[PDB]
Amino acid sequence: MDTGAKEDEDETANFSDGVTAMGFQSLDTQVSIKDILRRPVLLFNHVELDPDYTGFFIPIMPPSRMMQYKSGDKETSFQRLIGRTPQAAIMNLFRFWRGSLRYTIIIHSTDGHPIYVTHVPHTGNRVYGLMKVNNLHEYTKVPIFGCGLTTEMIIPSVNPSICVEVPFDTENNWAVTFDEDAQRNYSWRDKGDTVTGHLVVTPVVSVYMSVWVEAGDDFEVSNFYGPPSVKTNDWNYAFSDEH
Amino acid sequence: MDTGAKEDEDETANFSDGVTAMGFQSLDTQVSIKDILRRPVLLFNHVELDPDYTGFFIPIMPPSRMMQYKSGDKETSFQRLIGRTPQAAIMNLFRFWRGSLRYTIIIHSTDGHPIYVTHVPHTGNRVYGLMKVNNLHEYTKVPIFGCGLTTEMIIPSVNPSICVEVPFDTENNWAVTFDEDAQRNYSWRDKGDTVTGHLVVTPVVSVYMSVWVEAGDDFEVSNFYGPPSVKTNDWNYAFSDEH
Amino acid sequence: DNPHRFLPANVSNRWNEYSSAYLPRV
Amino acid sequence: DKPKDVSSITIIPKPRLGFPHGKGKSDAVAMRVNPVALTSFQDVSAYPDEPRTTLDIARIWGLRSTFNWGSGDEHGKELFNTVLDPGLRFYDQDYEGQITPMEYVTGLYNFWSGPIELRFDFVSNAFHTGTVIISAEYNRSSTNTDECQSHSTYTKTFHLGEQKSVHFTVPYIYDTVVRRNTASAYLPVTDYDKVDNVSRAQAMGIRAESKMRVKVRVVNVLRPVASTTSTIEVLVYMRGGKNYALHGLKQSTYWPSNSVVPIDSFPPDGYDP
Amino acid sequence: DKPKDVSSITIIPKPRLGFPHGKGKSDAVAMRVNPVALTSFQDVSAYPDEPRTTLDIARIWGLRSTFNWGSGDEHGKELFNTVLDPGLRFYDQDYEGQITPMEYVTGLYNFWSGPIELRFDFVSNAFHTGTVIISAEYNRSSTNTDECQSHSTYTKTFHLGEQKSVHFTVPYIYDTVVRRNTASAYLPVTDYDKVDNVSRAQAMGIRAESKMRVKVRVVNVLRPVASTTSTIEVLVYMRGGKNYALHGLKQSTYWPSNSVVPIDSFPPDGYDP
Amino acid sequence: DKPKDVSSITIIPKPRLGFPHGKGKSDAVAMRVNPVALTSFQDVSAYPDEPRTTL
Amino acid sequence: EVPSKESIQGDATQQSSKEENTIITRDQQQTVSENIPSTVGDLVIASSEPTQQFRSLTNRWMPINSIRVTVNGKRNDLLAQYYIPEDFLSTHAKCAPNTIPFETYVYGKYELEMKFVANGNKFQCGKVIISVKFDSYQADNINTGFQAALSRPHIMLDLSTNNEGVLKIPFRYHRAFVRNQTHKTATAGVRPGKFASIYVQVLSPLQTGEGGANDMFIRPFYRYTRAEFAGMSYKVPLT
């Protein structure tokens, strides 16, 4: 960051700065960056799971321009409004982050069938959605949760949602937020450095699911990049205060 | 154990040892043996119970090479990935253990029908799965839980999972972890000394179930054996960082 | 195929990103 | 002994603990060996000069606009004239370009208040000489031709010459303690849908368009020497004041236009040629 | 009296208490007469010399490899040359044998760091005499024929003779504070399935192959007496350093090959002949 | 260590906390950034001559 | 800071920066970007062996290629750009003594300084911005406008006054070290020799009078203020 006060060499009289209007309406101050990023953001809105696959992969990265919908391109399971959240706009200014995130899973069920969650550490790949790992046609004998990685479980009848806090498991000082191109085939060890691992979500039977995300308590952004080149058309979809 | 520093008789100058990278990423230190073995391991993945049998037997022993799948042999109800867990690899180095284990049962139901759990003390046999004890065709009159052994109960509607902590009930100082052969017919009082008892799980109607396991708080391993002769083929099922 | 996979040779370096010599990219 | 436990309490069962808040308490379960361990920031930590709040971002000088000032511009002529609203840049057209950091951060919030600062950098030399008057006009606005109406407001006459930069704090003077943002709180249209009056009728909010303007007029006509350029460009920077304040997090006004590509599975999705 | 209880609290219902952790709190119900009794370790307890952590196991000297050194080996010849990665032994073939205790324990973890120690035991006598140079080479590797390139790195020339053992700490010098493991985090293939590129494309992680090598070259050609053997064998041991560190528990790289039999019900399953 | 938690209590589950009352306790979840923040009445407050009760 | 009356040698109140065996004077005032810190503490972990400095070699001012500003360049046009340290090794000033340590060592941490000297006549006018982007690999074509340039650490050059700028660049990278040299036997998985990018952009176009010059020139100089090297290896030619 650079204020640009460097270039403010003017030393002439000016109008008053008045008094701050902070804490006037309510004490709840929403200006802090570490408070905005700690608000939950929605990712997958009623996406389907299958017992036929290894599980549903959720790449551990903060929501930003990476997870943005552009008009008239291929359809994804990611919800379209990730691009335009306040929590995304912040992550578009910082290219480095570090610390834990907080994923919230909500299964649309009330059955005795247990659903599992598995933090796989940073292994270099950046897969999402349903995947058949190693193209096998049977995963019930050898499940991804049963291999012996850190694993919690949801039991929908008791409580059909968990809030996990995935650790910053990586060899890097910082996890990179974004790239100029997500779909570009460049050197393979650098493409991996935008995630710190994956969540996987295996069910017993087919079921739908919703996923939220936020920054944990221990979370810092850095390497400020300034604002991008943007477009808007909000004016168009509203009446003036004069008919 | 033996370091082998005995044989290090060299007294010449060497390069620096640097500074430890422990606690650099996070304070959560995962190096302790008593922390790895305290992580839960999955055993039975959606196996079926029956009211027609005495119950489902779970032999109280820690997960190791005993519970390993080899390719192209008889199929078992044990999940295949028990062999390759981090919690198994530790138990492959220690032949003695002592103290309590912690079994976690998850019934796939939300009915008012109660399921029971019964710690049978070390009685010499090493049975698992469903068994008709004494070949009777009716166990509803005289249940295994009703005989008057220590017994807890799951009520799926309230909470469809329990975590029991089975005591170290045996006449031995140590429970043996593994053998060179599980299926070998040798002297009968020694084959028994690899379990400290059984869990049994009786339901009212038919239902599916999942079982996890770990070491309790009070748990010590000893009699270190070093590493076994191993095979691997991980290289084969992954791309290099160079296409 | 997917055009984003590889950048055209005239604008790019060996490492498959925009060359420092190529100023017109903006 | 096995004495009965007579103590009890009435509980209200909620699914999540502090779901909508950005602070306080949480029921999160750490996916670690140690349940109470955290990421160490002993060596690698946030650098002291990074912005800790959005109000720090809103104090970064961004280049808002530019305009020209020739020798042919007779006295009283409007060189520059905009509605100074940090909410929206235009009310009557699609905007595309590079929005300033204080405008970018403002678009995240439904309400703003406090003074705004400007800085006019004249891209000139010693041999250029003129005078402009920068006026802030509230509620009622002047006519383009009547310079006198612009002079009867809050003004700062800048004598250009050796000094090529003038700072100007715009004082915050409105009927309400906070203004609400002109951009919509929620807009689900993503595919450039052709808009009608039925669409407008079912908007999220009613755009309360700002009438507050900042005009720059010629006082003394620019008289440069023959050997230099007859027309200079002026750069108009803008940041929030020292008492700038924001409230009420909403869906962002602006979104990335240039070089947006959606992520795919690497390397499942045909990365291997 | 029967006064009303006005005290209450909002609870968030979870099924298990500290399921994923290896420490902290737990909701376990003891299957005992006494609910708070534990296994006594008054007499029978863990012996003081047993490894308490995996870092204690990673400090046990294991025999990694062997190689030969004859009189016919002209100066500069590579006697030994391996990629020193504790993750994997080979990148291009199936490994079978007895893996060292530091490699075995490393395979449980996704990340490692800190120095690695070697120890070269020459199976010789007083009448053998030569000189080897042990070099650790990072990022860029030398050619087999250019011994000079190997000399311009971190080296320890060992003068063999009366002393038959040399210790060598390999200094940890990489771009990242921790390296990630080359072996996969999760591999569900158990039945030696014939692999294709579609299988590879849907892997768990991308194998970041190490370029860090340790070479042993001849400085002074081995000149033994006529009455002894012309070729000796060298034993190369390996353990983790004093500042060795591991993190991120995964599915184990290696698994038991020799004498694995699955358990059966004793004595139901035809044990009675 | 991972010692077992032996402490427990019997709870009576109710949906709302102090639904019918005009005072006392409440289980309300604030829709704010800060969970314990309130509306400031530092400048704008009830005037002293306004009726505080129905009496 | 304050000018004096005209003597035989004009207005003789020039300052000068003397770094090792290279001096650079300046006529008018100097703009300086804020001195800000780098990542430290990981150094002792990531490198087991001790790290070396060659101040006499690396701390001396080295001029690179000249930049040509014309009256045809619009706002947001890149005048030049530099991937560092890559371009200071093998693209600009290939036979500089500043590059000598990069031959032998494979890793390092680099805090730089970059002085810019412009020379346009008094009847010209224009604004050029120079700004650093920390760890820009596969992020060069985004957040790369004049607007983002004003936000990131930057200096500003007026082309009429001929002021000097000095941009201080801390080491802010996602890894502990940056790899110096690519090689045939080395890994292709990592991009080596680029931890940052320096953009020089037209903030306002150059303008001139009747029968005036249609261009003028800027000259960058660089120097490492803290160049620590780790992992010694056999010496190689640079790219």
* D6 close contact with E: CB closer than 8 A: no
Nearest residue of chain B to residue D32 (CA atoms): B28
- Cβ separation of B110 and A111 shorter than 8 Å? yes
Residue pair G79/G203 in contact (Cβ under 8 Å)? The answer is no
Both tokens assigned to C17: 């990103």
Interface mutation target, options D103, D125, D233, chain G, most CBs of G under 10 Å: D125
Distance CA G168, CA A213 (A): 37
Residue pair G119/G216 in contact (Cβ under 8 Å)? The answer is yes
Sheet holding D109-113, edge to edge: D179-180, D109-113, D245-249
Domain of residue A235: give its range.
1-243
- Cβ separation of G46 and E153 shorter than 8 Å? no
Domain ranges of chain G: 1-239
* A119 close contact with G: CB closer than 8 A: no
Interface mutation target, options A117, A125, A145, A170, chain B, most CBs of B under 10 Å: A145
Q: Closest by alpha carbon to A49, among A109, A125, A122, A129?
A: A129
Which chain C positions have a beta carbon within 8 Å of G141's beta carbon? 18, 25-26
Q: Closest by alpha carbon to G91, among G55, G62, G131?
A: G62
Write the DSSP assignment of G193-235 as a string of letters: SEEEEEEEEEEEEEE--TT--SEEEEEEEEEEEEEEEEEE---
Q: Closest by alpha carbon to G144, among G135, G131, G156?
A: G131
Cα distances (angstroms) measured from residue E30 to each of A39, B76, B145, E14: 40, 29, 17, 20
Buried b / exposed e across D241-252, counting CB within 10 Å, b at 16+?
Answer: bebbbbbbbbbb
Rg from Cα positions in chain C: 9
Distance CA B193, CA F17 (A): 56
The SS3 of residue D60 is coil
Residue pair G192/G60 in contact (Cβ under 8 Å)? The answer is no
The SS3 of residue G164 is strand
Cα–Cα–Cα angle for G16, G20, G21, rounded to 5 degrees: 85
Both tokens assigned to A82: 């990730």
Q: Do chains F and G touch (3 or more CB pairs under 8 A)?
A: no
Q: What's the sign of the alpha-carbon dihedral D117, D123, D126, D127?
A: negative
Interface mutation target, options A56, A122, A134, chain E, most CBs of E under 10 Å: A134
- Cβ separation of B233 and E192 shorter than 8 Å? yes
Q: What are phi and psi of D213, to 5 degrees?
A: -120, 160
* D42 close contact with E: CB closer than 8 A: no
Residue pair D136/D268 in contact (Cβ under 8 Å)? The answer is no
Cα distances (angstroms) measured from residue B171 to each of B218, D26, E36: 18, 47, 22
Both tokens assigned to E205: 């992680």
Cα–Cα–Cα angle for A51, A52, A56, rounded to 5 degrees: 65
Per DSSP, which regions of chain B are E strands? 41-49, 55-59, 94-107, 115-121, 129-131, 151-154, 161-165, 175-176, 197-202, 207-224, 229-232
Q: Which amino acid is at A242?
A: E
Residue pair E23/B27 in contact (Cβ under 8 Å)? The answer is no
Q: What are phi and psi of B55, to 5 degrees?
A: 155, 180
Element (H, E) at E10: strand E8-11
Distance CA G198, CA B115 (A): 69
Which chain G positions have a beta carbon within 8 Å of E153's beta carbon? 232-234
Distance CA A165, CA A162 (A): 10
F47 exposure class (CB count in 10 Å sphere: 0-12, 13-18, 19+) = exposed
* B42 close contact with E: CB closer than 8 A: no
Both tokens assigned to D117: 């600062």
Query: Whose structure tokens read 């490994």?
Result: E95
Q: How many CB atoms lie within 10 A of CB D211?
A: 12
The SS3 of residue D72 is coil
What is the length of chain F? 55
- Cβ separation of D30 and E12 shorter than 8 Å? no
Which chain F positions have a beta carbon within 8 Å of E39's beta carbon? none
- Cβ separation of D11 and F11 shorter than 8 Å? yes
Residue E267, CA atoms < 13 Å, CB-side half-sphere: 13
Cα distances (angstroms) measured from residue E106 to each of A144, A145, B238: 20, 21, 19
The SS3 of residue B188 is helix
Minimal Cα–Cα distance from F53 to chain D, Å?
A: 30
Both tokens assigned to G235: 């010496």
Residue A116, CA atoms < 13 Å, CB-side half-sphere: 31
Distance CA B122, CA B124 (A): 6
- Which A-chain residues 155-194 have CB contacts (< 8 A) with chain C? 181, 183-187
At a CB cut-off of 8 Å and minimum separation 6, what does A86 contact?
Answer: A36, A39, D108, D109, D249, D250, D251, D252
Q: Do chains B and C touch (3 or more CB pairs under 8 A)?
A: no
At a CB cut-off of 8 Å and minimum separation 6, what does A50 contact?
Answer: A130, A203, A206
Which chain C positions have a beta carbon within 8 Å of G144's beta carbon? 26
Q: Closest by alpha carbon to A180, among A124, A241, A229?
A: A229
Cα distances (angstroms) measured from residue D12 to each of B186, E5, G5: 59, 14, 84
Distance CA D247, CA D83 (A): 22
Q: What's the sign of the alpha-carbon dihedral B202, B207, B213, B218?
A: negative
Distance CA D231, CA A18 (A): 37
Per DSSP, which regions of D84-115 are E strands? 95-98, 109-113
Dihedral of the CA atoms D224, D225, D230, D233 (nearest 10)? -50
Nearest residue of chain E to residue A195 (CA atoms): E205
Minimal Cα–Cα distance from D162 to chain F, Å?
A: 47
Write the DSSP assignment of E28-60 as a string of letters: -EE-SSSTT-----SSS---TTS-SBHHHHTTS
Choose among G45, G49, G179: nearest Cβ to E154.
G49
Distance CA G213, CA G71 (A): 9
Choose among A120, A127, A134: nearest Cβ to E188.
A134
Helix (H) and strand (E) counts in chain B: 3, 11
* A131 close contact with D: CB closer than 8 A: yes
Query: Whose structure tokens read 């024929």?
Result: E145
By DSSP bridging, strand E8-11 and strand D8-13 are parallel
Minimal Cα–Cα distance from G47 to chain B, Å?
A: 7
Minimal Cα–Cα distance from D8 to chain F, Å?
A: 5
At a CB cut-off of 8 Å and minimum separation 6, what does E225 contact?
Answer: E127
- The subunits that touch chain E, with at least 3 C-beta pairs less than 8 Å apart, are A, B, D, F, G
- SS3 track for chain A: CCCCHHHCCCCCCCCCCCCCCCCCCECCCCCEHHHHCCCCEEEEEEEEECCCCCEEEEECCCCCHHHCCCCCCCCCCCCHHHCCCHHHHHHCCEEEEEEEEEEEEEECCCCCCCEEEEEEECCCCECCEEECHHHCCCCCCCCCCCCCCCEEEEECCCECEEEEEECCCCCCCCEECCCCCCCCCCCHHHHHHHCCEEEEEECCCCEEEEEEEEEEEEEEEEEECCCCEEEECCHHHCCECCC
Nearest residue of chain E to residue F7 (CA atoms): E27
Q: What are phi and psi of B221, to 5 degrees?
A: -105, 155
- Cβ separation of B21 and G45 shorter than 8 Å? yes
Residue pair B35/E23 in contact (Cβ under 8 Å)? The answer is yes
- Cβ separation of F1 and B165 shorter than 8 Å? no
Distance CA B193, CA B196 (A): 7
Cα–Cα–Cα angle for G44, G50, G51, rounded to 5 degrees: 90
Give pairs for E64-67: CB < 8 Å, separation 24+.
Answer: E64/E100, E64/E103, E64/E118, E64/E236, E64/E237, E64/E238, E65/E236, E66/E233, E66/E234, E66/E235, E66/E236, E67/E216, E67/E233, E67/E234, E67/E236
- The subunits that touch chain B, with at least 3 C-beta pairs less than 8 Å apart, are A, D, E, F, G
Residue pair E224/A158 in contact (Cβ under 8 Å)? The answer is no
Residue pair E267/B184 in contact (Cβ under 8 Å)? The answer is no
Domain ranges of chain E: 1-273
Q: What are phi and psi of G18, to 5 degrees?
A: -105, 110
DSSP-derived secondary structure letter, D55: H
Choose among D7, D9, D23: nearest Cβ to F33.
D23
Element (H, E) at E121: strand E116-123
Query: Whose structure tokens read 């921790």?
Result: E178
Q: What are phi and psi of A236, to 5 degrees?
A: -70, -35
Q: Closest by alpha carbon to F5, among E13, E16, D31?
A: E16
- Cβ separation of C20 and G137 shorter than 8 Å? no
DSSP-derived secondary structure letter, E194: P
Residue pair E250/E108 in contact (Cβ under 8 Å)? The answer is yes
Both tokens assigned to E15: 């099924």
Q: What's the sign of the alpha-carbon dihedral A91, A94, A96, A100?
A: negative
Choose among F9, F30, F34: nearest Cβ to D7.
F9
Dihedral of the CA atoms A177, A179, A183, A186 (nearest 10)? -110
Q: Which amino acid is at F45?
A: S
- Cβ separation of D261 and C4 shorter than 8 Å? yes
- The subunits that touch chain A, with at least 3 C-beta pairs less than 8 Å apart, are B, C, D, E, F, G
Q: What are phi and psi of G25, to 5 degrees?
A: -90, 170
Q: What is the largest CA-CA distance in chain G?
A: 65
Q: Which residues pair with D233 in a beta bridge?
A: D68, D123
Residue E151, CA atoms < 13 Å, CB-side half-sphere: 10
Residue pair E260/B124 in contact (Cβ under 8 Å)? The answer is no
Q: How many CB atoms lie within 10 A of CB E228?
A: 12
Residue pair D182/D210 in contact (Cβ under 8 Å)? The answer is yes
Both tokens assigned to F24: 């006392």
Distance CA D229, CA D124 (A): 9
Write the DSSP assignment of G63-92 as a string of letters: E---EEEETT--TT-EEEEEEEEHHHHHTS
For chain B, the domain total comes to 1
Q: Which amino acid is at G231?
A: G
Structure obtained using: cryo-EM
Nearest residue of chain E to residue B241 (CA atoms): E208
DSSP-derived secondary structure letter, B155: B
First to last CA, chain F: 63
- Cβ separation of F11 and D12 shorter than 8 Å? no
Residue pair D57/D102 in contact (Cβ under 8 Å)? The answer is yes
Distance CA E250, CA E111 (A): 10
Distance CA B126, CA B98 (A): 18
User: Could you tell me how far CA F24 lies from the centroid of its own chain?
Assistant: 8
Q: Which amino acid is at E205?
A: G
- Cβ separation of B241 and E208 shorter than 8 Å? yes
Nearest residue of chain D to residue C2 (CA atoms): D270
* E41 close contact with D: CB closer than 8 A: no
Distance CA G170, CA G152 (A): 12
Distance CA A144, CA E188 (A): 8
Minimal Cα–Cα distance from A180 to chain C, Å?
A: 10
User: Could you tell me how far CA B206 lies from the centroid of its own chain?
Assistant: 25
The SS3 of residue D56 is helix
- Cβ separation of D29 and E23 shorter than 8 Å? no
